[PDB]
Amino acid sequence: IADVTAVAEAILPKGSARVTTSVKFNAPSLLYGALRDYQKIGLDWLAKLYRKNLNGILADEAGLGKTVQIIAFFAHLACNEGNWGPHLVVVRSCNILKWELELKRWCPGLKILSYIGSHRELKAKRQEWAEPNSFHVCITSYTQFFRGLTAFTRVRWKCLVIDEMQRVKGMTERHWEAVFTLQSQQRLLLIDSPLHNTFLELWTMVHFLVPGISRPYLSSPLRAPSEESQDYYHKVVIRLHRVTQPFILRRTKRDVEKQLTKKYEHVLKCRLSNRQKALYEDVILQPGTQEALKSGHFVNVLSIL
């Protein structure tokens, strides 16, 4: 455990290395887009993780333009590794059109197959699966994807991406077990909410961090956490924090992204009109208003406000 932590600390740049590139790999000329310093550092870290076949999770906050990062990663893989696909993206039915239009604008040459339709259409698509290059990027709904779970499990997916999963209520343990059953060299997991103090969720994250544990899940080694083992549990929590520290590092729109927009919320004082002033004085000079002020009844003064 010491060796892995030391290697992770050595890999992560510290200090002045976040302004000057320590790796001589220049950006591709064909790539269209501007990369900031933290973006370049994250791209280098992800490339090193993929090249070394070491698992890692990017815990960056949502809304930072994941599409740009995904496009850059696919471009880097295609230029060097030639990994054109297949790649699995799971989104709700309301989001298919967004990614479809984005892919059509960015790359009309790539065929996009949505595996949704009638039974006869599904049969025709199944007959078309034998044709090579029938589909390269696949987007499908949750229900239809889980309907053909046995068929889809045969293909090893290079990367797993899930978005807006917590919003679905009725998540059975079988679906989570099937998700864990999928084997991928690179695993990505996104959390759009603060970490809850829930045993089940943290246990699932801890199991996802370290794959291939020989201990069965059902065989609980220590239950009924009495007062005797409080020090041991505190030590275990410290060890888990030490394990999770190097792979997780929050980056914000205000602290790290120092290419800041010059935001300011201006306040304009406006002089009231004479009609407005007359109505204002009439409402204040109303004896009911003074009675509400003196009595302090909440609804009266609130309605006056």
Side-chain angles (χ1 to χ4, degrees), residues 263-304:
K263 181 185 171 191
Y264 181 126
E265 46 180 304
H266 301 283
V267 177
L268 304 181
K269 80 296 190 178
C270 301
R271 189 183 293 97
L272 291 177
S273 77
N274 287 314
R275 196 165 180 242
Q276 282 178 299
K277 284 156 63 180
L279 295 181
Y280 201 86
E281 294 284 6
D282 287 352
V283 168
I284 280 166
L285 294 171
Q286 167 48 232
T289 299
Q290 299 297 318
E291 286 169 21
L293 173 137
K294 188 59 59 173
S295 60
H297 294 303
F298 159 70
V299 297
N300 296 356
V301 299
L302 185 277
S303 55
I304 287 154

CSV table of all heavy atoms in Angstrom, one decimal, residues 263-304:
chain,number,residue,atom,x,y,z
A,263,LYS,N,-16.9,39.0,-13.5
A,263,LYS,CA,-18.3,39.1,-13.1
A,263,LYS,C,-18.6,40.2,-12.1
A,263,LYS,O,-17.7,40.4,-11.2
A,263,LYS,CB,-18.8,37.7,-12.5
A,263,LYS,CG,-20.2,37.6,-12.1
A,263,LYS,CD,-20.5,36.2,-11.4
A,263,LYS,CE,-21.8,36.2,-10.8
A,263,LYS,NZ,-22.0,35.0,-9.9
A,264,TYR,N,-19.7,40.9,-12.2
A,264,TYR,CA,-20.1,41.9,-11.2
A,264,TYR,C,-21.6,42.1,-11.4
A,264,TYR,O,-22.0,42.2,-12.5
A,264,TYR,CB,-19.2,43.2,-11.4
A,264,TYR,CG,-19.5,44.4,-10.5
A,264,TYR,CD1,-18.4,44.9,-9.8
A,264,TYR,CD2,-20.7,45.0,-10.2
A,264,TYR,CE1,-18.5,46.0,-9.0
A,264,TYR,CE2,-20.8,46.0,-9.4
A,264,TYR,CZ,-19.7,46.5,-8.7
A,264,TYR,OH,-19.7,47.6,-7.9
A,265,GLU,N,-22.3,42.1,-10.3
A,265,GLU,CA,-23.7,42.3,-10.3
A,265,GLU,C,-24.0,43.8,-9.9
A,265,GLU,O,-24.0,44.2,-8.8
A,265,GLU,CB,-24.4,41.3,-9.3
A,265,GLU,CG,-23.8,41.2,-7.9
A,265,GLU,CD,-24.6,40.2,-7.1
A,265,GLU,OE1,-25.8,40.4,-6.9
A,265,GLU,OE2,-24.0,39.2,-6.6
A,266,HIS,N,-24.2,44.6,-11.0
A,266,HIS,CA,-24.4,46.0,-10.8
A,266,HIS,C,-25.8,46.3,-10.1
A,266,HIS,O,-26.8,45.5,-10.3
A,266,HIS,CB,-24.4,46.7,-12.1
A,266,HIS,CG,-23.1,46.6,-12.8
A,266,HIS,ND1,-21.9,47.3,-12.4
A,266,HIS,CD2,-22.7,45.8,-13.8
A,266,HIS,CE1,-20.9,46.9,-13.2
A,266,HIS,NE2,-21.3,46.0,-14.1
A,267,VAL,N,-25.8,47.3,-9.3
A,267,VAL,CA,-27.0,47.8,-8.5
A,267,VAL,C,-27.2,49.2,-9.0
A,267,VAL,O,-26.4,50.1,-8.8
A,267,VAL,CB,-26.8,47.7,-7.0
A,267,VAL,CG1,-28.0,48.2,-6.3
A,267,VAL,CG2,-26.5,46.2,-6.6
A,268,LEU,N,-28.4,49.5,-9.6
A,268,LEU,CA,-28.8,50.8,-10.1
A,268,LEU,C,-29.9,51.3,-9.2
A,268,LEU,O,-31.0,50.7,-9.1
A,268,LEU,CB,-29.3,50.7,-11.5
A,268,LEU,CG,-28.3,50.1,-12.5
A,268,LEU,CD1,-28.9,50.1,-13.9
A,268,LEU,CD2,-27.0,50.8,-12.5
A,269,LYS,N,-29.6,52.4,-8.4
A,269,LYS,CA,-30.6,53.1,-7.7
A,269,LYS,C,-31.5,53.9,-8.6
A,269,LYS,O,-30.9,54.7,-9.5
A,269,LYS,CB,-29.9,54.0,-6.6
A,269,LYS,CG,-29.3,55.3,-7.0
A,269,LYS,CD,-28.2,55.2,-8.0
A,269,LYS,CE,-27.5,56.6,-8.2
A,269,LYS,NZ,-26.3,56.4,-9.1
A,270,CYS,N,-32.8,53.8,-8.5
A,270,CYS,CA,-33.7,54.4,-9.3
A,270,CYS,C,-34.6,55.4,-8.5
A,270,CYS,O,-35.1,55.0,-7.5
A,270,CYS,CB,-34.6,53.4,-10.0
A,270,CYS,SG,-33.7,52.2,-11.1
A,271,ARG,N,-34.8,56.6,-9.0
A,271,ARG,CA,-35.6,57.6,-8.3
A,271,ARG,C,-37.1,57.3,-8.7
A,271,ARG,O,-37.4,57.2,-9.8
A,271,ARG,CB,-35.2,59.0,-8.8
A,271,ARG,CG,-35.8,60.1,-8.0
A,271,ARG,CD,-35.4,61.5,-8.5
A,271,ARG,NE,-34.0,61.8,-8.3
A,271,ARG,CZ,-33.0,61.6,-9.2
A,271,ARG,NH1,-33.3,61.1,-10.4
A,271,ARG,NH2,-31.8,61.9,-8.9
A,272,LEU,N,-37.9,57.3,-7.6
A,272,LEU,CA,-39.3,57.0,-7.8
A,272,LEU,C,-40.0,58.1,-8.5
A,272,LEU,O,-39.6,59.3,-8.4
A,272,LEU,CB,-40.0,56.7,-6.5
A,272,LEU,CG,-39.6,55.5,-5.7
A,272,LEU,CD1,-40.4,55.5,-4.4
A,272,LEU,CD2,-40.0,54.2,-6.5
A,273,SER,N,-41.1,57.8,-9.3
A,273,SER,CA,-41.9,58.8,-9.9
A,273,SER,C,-42.8,59.4,-8.8
A,273,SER,O,-42.9,58.9,-7.7
A,273,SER,CB,-42.8,58.1,-11.0
A,273,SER,OG,-43.9,57.4,-10.4
A,274,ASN,N,-43.4,60.6,-9.2
A,274,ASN,CA,-44.3,61.3,-8.3
A,274,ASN,C,-45.5,60.5,-8.0
A,274,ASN,O,-46.0,60.5,-6.9
A,274,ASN,CB,-44.6,62.6,-8.9
A,274,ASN,CG,-43.5,63.6,-8.9
A,274,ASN,OD1,-42.8,63.7,-7.9
A,274,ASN,ND2,-43.3,64.3,-10.0
A,275,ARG,N,-46.1,59.7,-9.0
A,275,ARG,CA,-47.2,58.9,-8.8
A,275,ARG,C,-46.8,57.7,-7.8
A,275,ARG,O,-47.6,57.4,-6.9
A,275,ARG,CB,-47.7,58.3,-10.1
A,275,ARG,CG,-49.1,57.7,-10.0
A,275,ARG,CD,-49.6,57.5,-11.4
A,275,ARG,NE,-51.0,56.9,-11.4
A,275,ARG,CZ,-51.3,55.7,-12.0
A,275,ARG,NH1,-50.5,54.9,-12.6
A,275,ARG,NH2,-52.6,55.3,-11.8
A,276,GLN,N,-45.6,57.2,-8.0
A,276,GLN,CA,-45.1,56.1,-7.1
A,276,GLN,C,-44.9,56.7,-5.7
A,276,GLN,O,-45.3,56.0,-4.7
A,276,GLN,CB,-43.8,55.6,-7.6
A,276,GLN,CG,-43.9,54.6,-8.8
A,276,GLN,CD,-42.6,54.1,-9.2
A,276,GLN,OE1,-41.7,54.9,-9.7
A,276,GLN,NE2,-42.3,52.8,-9.2
A,277,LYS,N,-44.4,57.9,-5.6
A,277,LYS,CA,-44.2,58.5,-4.3
A,277,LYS,C,-45.5,58.8,-3.6
A,277,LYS,O,-45.7,58.6,-2.4
A,277,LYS,CB,-43.4,59.8,-4.4
A,277,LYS,CG,-41.9,59.7,-4.7
A,277,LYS,CD,-41.3,60.8,-5.4
A,277,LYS,CE,-41.4,62.1,-4.6
A,277,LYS,NZ,-40.8,63.3,-5.3
A,278,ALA,N,-46.6,59.2,-4.4
A,278,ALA,CA,-47.9,59.4,-3.8
A,278,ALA,C,-48.5,58.2,-3.2
A,278,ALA,O,-49.0,58.1,-2.1
A,278,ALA,CB,-48.8,60.1,-4.8
A,279,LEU,N,-48.4,57.1,-4.0
A,279,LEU,CA,-48.9,55.8,-3.5
A,279,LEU,C,-48.2,55.3,-2.3
A,279,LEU,O,-48.7,54.8,-1.4
A,279,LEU,CB,-48.9,54.8,-4.7
A,279,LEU,CG,-49.8,55.0,-5.9
A,279,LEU,CD1,-49.6,53.9,-6.9
A,279,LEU,CD2,-51.3,55.2,-5.5
A,280,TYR,N,-46.8,55.5,-2.3
A,280,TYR,CA,-46.0,55.0,-1.2
A,280,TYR,C,-46.3,55.8,0.1
A,280,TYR,O,-46.5,55.2,1.1
A,280,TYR,CB,-44.5,55.3,-1.6
A,280,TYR,CG,-43.5,54.5,-0.9
A,280,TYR,CD1,-43.1,53.2,-1.3
A,280,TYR,CD2,-42.8,55.0,0.2
A,280,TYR,CE1,-42.1,52.5,-0.7
A,280,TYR,CE2,-41.8,54.3,0.9
A,280,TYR,CZ,-41.5,53.1,0.4
A,280,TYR,OH,-40.5,52.3,1.1
A,281,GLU,N,-46.5,57.1,0.0
A,281,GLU,CA,-46.8,57.9,1.1
A,281,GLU,C,-48.3,57.6,1.6
A,281,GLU,O,-48.5,57.6,2.8
A,281,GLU,CB,-46.7,59.4,0.8
A,281,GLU,CG,-45.3,59.9,0.5
A,281,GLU,CD,-44.4,60.0,1.8
A,281,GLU,OE1,-44.9,59.6,2.9
A,281,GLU,OE2,-43.3,60.5,1.7
A,282,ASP,N,-49.2,57.3,0.7
A,282,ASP,CA,-50.5,57.0,1.1
A,282,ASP,C,-50.6,55.7,1.8
A,282,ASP,O,-51.3,55.5,2.8
A,282,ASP,CB,-51.4,56.9,-0.2
A,282,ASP,CG,-51.8,58.3,-0.7
A,282,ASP,OD1,-51.5,59.3,-0.1
A,282,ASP,OD2,-52.4,58.3,-1.8
A,283,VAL,N,-49.8,54.7,1.4
A,283,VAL,CA,-49.7,53.4,2.1
A,283,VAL,C,-49.1,53.5,3.4
A,283,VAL,O,-49.5,52.9,4.4
A,283,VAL,CB,-49.0,52.3,1.2
A,283,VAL,CG1,-48.7,51.1,2.0
A,283,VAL,CG2,-49.9,52.0,0.0
A,284,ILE,N,-48.0,54.3,3.5
A,284,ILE,CA,-47.4,54.5,4.8
A,284,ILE,C,-48.3,55.3,5.8
A,284,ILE,O,-48.4,54.9,6.9
A,284,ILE,CB,-46.0,55.2,4.6
A,284,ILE,CG1,-45.0,54.1,4.2
A,284,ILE,CG2,-45.5,55.9,5.9
A,284,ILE,CD1,-43.7,54.6,3.7
A,285,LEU,N,-48.9,56.3,5.3
A,285,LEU,CA,-49.8,57.2,6.1
A,285,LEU,C,-51.1,56.6,6.4
A,285,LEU,O,-51.9,57.2,7.1
A,285,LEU,CB,-50.0,58.5,5.5
A,285,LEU,CG,-48.7,59.4,5.3
A,285,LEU,CD1,-49.0,60.6,4.5
A,285,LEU,CD2,-48.2,59.9,6.7
A,286,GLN,N,-51.4,55.4,5.8
A,286,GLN,CA,-52.7,54.7,6.2
A,286,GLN,C,-52.6,54.3,7.7
A,286,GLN,O,-51.6,53.8,8.1
A,286,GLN,CB,-52.8,53.4,5.3
A,286,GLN,CG,-53.8,52.4,5.8
A,286,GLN,CD,-55.2,53.0,6.0
A,286,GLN,OE1,-55.7,52.7,7.1
A,286,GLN,NE2,-55.7,53.8,5.1
A,287,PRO,N,-53.6,54.6,8.5
A,287,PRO,CA,-53.6,54.2,9.9
A,287,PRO,C,-53.5,52.7,10.1
A,287,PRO,O,-53.0,52.3,11.2
A,287,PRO,CB,-54.9,54.8,10.5
A,287,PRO,CG,-55.2,56.0,9.6
A,287,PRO,CD,-54.8,55.6,8.3
A,288,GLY,N,-54.0,51.9,9.2
A,288,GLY,CA,-53.8,50.5,9.3
A,288,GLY,C,-52.4,50.1,9.3
A,288,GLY,O,-51.9,49.1,10.0
A,289,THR,N,-51.6,50.7,8.4
A,289,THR,CA,-50.1,50.5,8.4
A,289,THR,C,-49.5,50.8,9.7
A,289,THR,O,-48.6,50.0,10.1
A,289,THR,CB,-49.5,51.3,7.2
A,289,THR,OG1,-50.1,50.9,6.0
A,289,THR,CG2,-48.0,51.0,7.2
A,290,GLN,N,-49.8,51.9,10.3
A,290,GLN,CA,-49.2,52.3,11.6
A,290,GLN,C,-49.7,51.3,12.7
A,290,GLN,O,-48.9,51.0,13.6
A,290,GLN,CB,-49.6,53.7,11.9
A,290,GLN,CG,-49.2,54.8,11.0
A,290,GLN,CD,-47.6,54.9,10.9
A,290,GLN,OE1,-46.9,54.8,11.9
A,290,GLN,NE2,-47.1,55.0,9.7
A,291,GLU,N,-50.9,50.8,12.6
A,291,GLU,CA,-51.4,49.9,13.6
A,291,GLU,C,-50.6,48.5,13.4
A,291,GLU,O,-50.3,47.9,14.4
A,291,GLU,CB,-52.9,49.6,13.4
A,291,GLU,CG,-53.7,50.7,13.9
A,291,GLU,CD,-55.2,50.6,13.5
A,291,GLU,OE1,-55.6,49.5,13.1
A,291,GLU,OE2,-55.9,51.6,13.5
A,292,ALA,N,-50.4,48.1,12.2
A,292,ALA,CA,-49.6,46.9,11.9
A,292,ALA,C,-48.1,47.1,12.4
A,292,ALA,O,-47.5,46.2,13.0
A,292,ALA,CB,-49.6,46.5,10.5
A,293,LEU,N,-47.6,48.3,12.2
A,293,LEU,CA,-46.2,48.6,12.7
A,293,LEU,C,-46.2,48.5,14.2
A,293,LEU,O,-45.2,47.9,14.8
A,293,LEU,CB,-45.8,49.9,12.2
A,293,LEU,CG,-44.4,50.5,12.7
A,293,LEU,CD1,-43.6,51.1,11.6
A,293,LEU,CD2,-44.7,51.5,13.8
A,294,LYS,N,-47.2,49.1,14.9
A,294,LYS,CA,-47.1,49.1,16.4
A,294,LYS,C,-47.4,47.7,16.9
A,294,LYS,O,-46.7,47.3,17.9
A,294,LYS,CB,-48.2,50.1,16.9
A,294,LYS,CG,-48.2,50.4,18.4
A,294,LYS,CD,-46.9,51.0,18.9
A,294,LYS,CE,-46.5,52.3,18.2
A,294,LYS,NZ,-45.3,52.9,18.9
A,295,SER,N,-48.4,47.0,16.4
A,295,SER,CA,-48.7,45.7,16.9
A,295,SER,C,-47.6,44.6,16.5
A,295,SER,O,-47.4,43.7,17.3
A,295,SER,CB,-50.1,45.2,16.4
A,295,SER,OG,-50.1,45.2,15.0
A,296,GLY,N,-47.0,44.8,15.3
A,296,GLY,CA,-46.0,43.8,14.9
A,296,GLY,C,-46.6,42.5,14.3
A,296,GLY,O,-45.8,41.5,14.3
A,297,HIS,N,-47.9,42.4,14.0
A,297,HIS,CA,-48.4,41.2,13.4
A,297,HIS,C,-47.7,40.9,12.0
A,297,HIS,O,-47.6,41.8,11.2
A,297,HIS,CB,-49.9,41.4,13.2
A,297,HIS,CG,-50.7,41.5,14.5
A,297,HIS,ND1,-50.6,40.5,15.4
A,297,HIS,CD2,-51.5,42.4,14.9
A,297,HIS,CE1,-51.4,40.9,16.5
A,297,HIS,NE2,-51.9,42.0,16.2
A,298,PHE,N,-47.3,39.7,11.9
A,298,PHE,CA,-46.4,39.3,10.7
A,298,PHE,C,-47.1,39.5,9.4
A,298,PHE,O,-46.6,40.0,8.4
A,298,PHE,CB,-45.9,37.9,10.9
A,298,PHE,CG,-45.3,37.3,9.7
A,298,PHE,CD1,-44.2,37.8,9.0
A,298,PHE,CD2,-46.0,36.3,9.1
A,298,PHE,CE1,-43.7,37.2,7.9
A,298,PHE,CE2,-45.6,35.7,7.9
A,298,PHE,CZ,-44.4,36.2,7.3
A,299,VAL,N,-48.3,38.9,9.3
A,299,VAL,CA,-49.0,38.9,8.0
A,299,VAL,C,-49.4,40.3,7.5
A,299,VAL,O,-49.3,40.6,6.3
A,299,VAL,CB,-50.3,38.0,8.1
A,299,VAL,CG1,-49.9,36.6,8.4
A,299,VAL,CG2,-51.3,38.5,9.1
A,300,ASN,N,-49.7,41.2,8.5
A,300,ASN,CA,-50.1,42.5,8.1
A,300,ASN,C,-48.9,43.3,7.5
A,300,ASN,O,-49.0,43.9,6.4
A,300,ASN,CB,-50.7,43.3,9.3
A,300,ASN,CG,-52.0,42.6,9.8
A,300,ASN,OD1,-52.5,41.7,9.2
A,300,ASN,ND2,-52.5,43.1,10.9
A,301,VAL,N,-47.8,43.3,8.3
A,301,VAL,CA,-46.6,44.0,7.8
A,301,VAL,C,-46.1,43.3,6.5
A,301,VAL,O,-45.5,44.0,5.6
A,301,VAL,CB,-45.5,44.1,8.9
A,301,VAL,CG1,-46.1,44.9,10.1
A,301,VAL,CG2,-45.0,42.7,9.3
A,302,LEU,N,-46.2,42.0,6.4
A,302,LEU,CA,-45.7,41.3,5.2
A,302,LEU,C,-46.5,41.7,4.0
A,302,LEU,O,-46.0,42.0,2.9
A,302,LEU,CB,-45.7,39.8,5.4
A,302,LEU,CG,-45.2,38.8,4.4
A,302,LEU,CD1,-46.2,38.5,3.3
A,302,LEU,CD2,-43.9,39.3,3.8
A,303,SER,N,-47.8,41.8,4.1
A,303,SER,CA,-48.7,42.2,3.0
A,303,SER,C,-48.4,43.7,2.7
A,303,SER,O,-48.5,44.1,1.5
A,303,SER,CB,-50.2,42.0,3.4
A,303,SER,OG,-50.5,42.6,4.6
A,304,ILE,N,-48.2,44.5,3.7
A,304,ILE,CA,-47.8,45.9,3.4
A,304,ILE,C,-46.5,46.0,2.7
A,304,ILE,O,-46.4,46.8,1.7
A,304,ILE,CB,-47.7,46.7,4.8
A,304,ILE,CG1,-49.1,46.9,5.3
A,304,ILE,CG2,-47.0,48.0,4.6
A,304,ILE,CD1,-49.2,47.1,6.9
